[PDB]
Design goal:
Shape: globular
Largest sheet: 6 strands, antiparallel, barrel
Helix content: under 10%
Number of helices: 1
Structural class: mainly beta
Number of strands: 12
Length: 182
């Protein structure tokens, strides 16, 4: 409808795939080459389905910060015959707060979904399903089941992926440029 949705659509149309594990279907953001991200609670194994194709997982790494605390991001390298558009230059370098964000989701259940979630707070510490977690972003939108892996954007920046909510508020793990230095 406007410039927020335009930037979000540009990311969804070229840099997402539908990932399916034993724990369900997730929006998965492709970042560069064959490297993508997914919430750690997706429990990625040796095999994953990508747009319903059986795919070997070449590597998977559940990130923690230097305090040894969960970040709820898993970086996955996919045995795929095709590279993602490199979007590392849209990633923020530091932890920050943001105005006017969009959460975008694409699964079987919720195709072509775009939610204007508004202002984003650097929340920091969250007990997320009983796991201490750092680098959490918070938005005052009642997000639901099926939205995990959703991409959080502003005009010009890809800032996080949706990892849960409490019924009133939604929560995303930060994406930083330093996670994807090759």
């Amino acid at each position: 409808m406007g410039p927020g949705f335009d930037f979000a659509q540009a990311i969804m149309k070229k840099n997402t795939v539908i990932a399916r594990t034993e724990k369900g279907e997730f929006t998965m953001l492709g970042v560069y080459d064959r490297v993508a991200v997914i919430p750690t609670h997706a429990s990625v194994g040796e095999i994953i389905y990508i747009n319903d194709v059986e795919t070997r997982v070449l590597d998977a790494c559940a990130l923690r910060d230097l305090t040894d605390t969960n970040l709820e991001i898993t970086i996955v390298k996919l045995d795929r015959n095709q590279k993602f558009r490199d979007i590392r230059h849209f990633l923020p370098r530091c932890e920050d707060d943001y105005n006017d964000a969009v959460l975008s989701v694409h699964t079987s259940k919720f195709p072509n979904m775009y939610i204007p979630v508004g202002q984003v707070t650097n929340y920091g510490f969250l007990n997320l399903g009983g796991t201490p977690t750092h680098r959490i972003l918070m938005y005052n939108f009642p997000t639901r089941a099926g939205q995990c892996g959703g991409v959080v954007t502003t005009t010009g920046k890809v800032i996080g992926i949706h990892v849960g909510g409490n019924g009133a508020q939604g929560f995303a793990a930060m994406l930083l440029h330093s996670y994807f230095t090759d």
